Amino acid sequence: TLLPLQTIREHAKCDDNPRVTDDLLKLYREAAFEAAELYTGLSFTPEKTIVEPIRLKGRRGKIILSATPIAGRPVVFYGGGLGSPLELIPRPGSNVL
Amino acid sequence: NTPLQAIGVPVALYDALMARAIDSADGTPNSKWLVTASRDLDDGQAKEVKEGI
C-alpha cells in the first residue's frame, strides 16, 4: 500500500513491454525496502512518542536527541539526579541542546 | 651642528616601519582552520557540519 506495483512499472518503463514478472517485482520491492531505511536508519514512524535514556556528555551536558523533534514542542527530561521533571524547547533542524 | 642633522633618514625609516607594524597588527585575520565545503551539501545539514566542528 506504500508503493503500488503500477507506479513501480510506470517509473521503471516496464509498461506493456514486460520484464520479470510481478513475483520478482514484489521480491525486488521487499529487498529494496531492506536497503533503504537501513542505509538511512529511519523507521515506519507515525506520530511518535519517543522515550529514550539520554546520556550525559560533557561537564555542561550536550544532549543530542536521536530523533530531532519537530520545531518547538518541549521535550521533557526526568530521572538521573533530576528530582523534578523539566521541559526544553529544542532546535528546529538540529537536535543538539 | 647637532646630531639631528644626520638622523633624519633613519628616524623616517623607523616611523615608517613601525607604522607597517601597527597597521598589519589590526587588519590581518587572527582565525585558523579555513574550512570550505563542497558544492552539494544541502545547507540545513552543512550547518550541522559547522556546529560540529
From TrEMBL, chain A:
Superkingdom of the organism of origin: Viruses
Protein name as catalogued: Head-to-tail connector complex protein
UniProtKB/TrEMBL annotation, chain B:
Official protein name in the record: Portal protein
Organism (species): Agrobacterium phage Milano
Phylogenetic lineage: Viruses, Duplodnaviria, Heunggongvirae, Uroviricota, Caudoviricetes
Portion of the parent chain present: 211 to 263 of 420
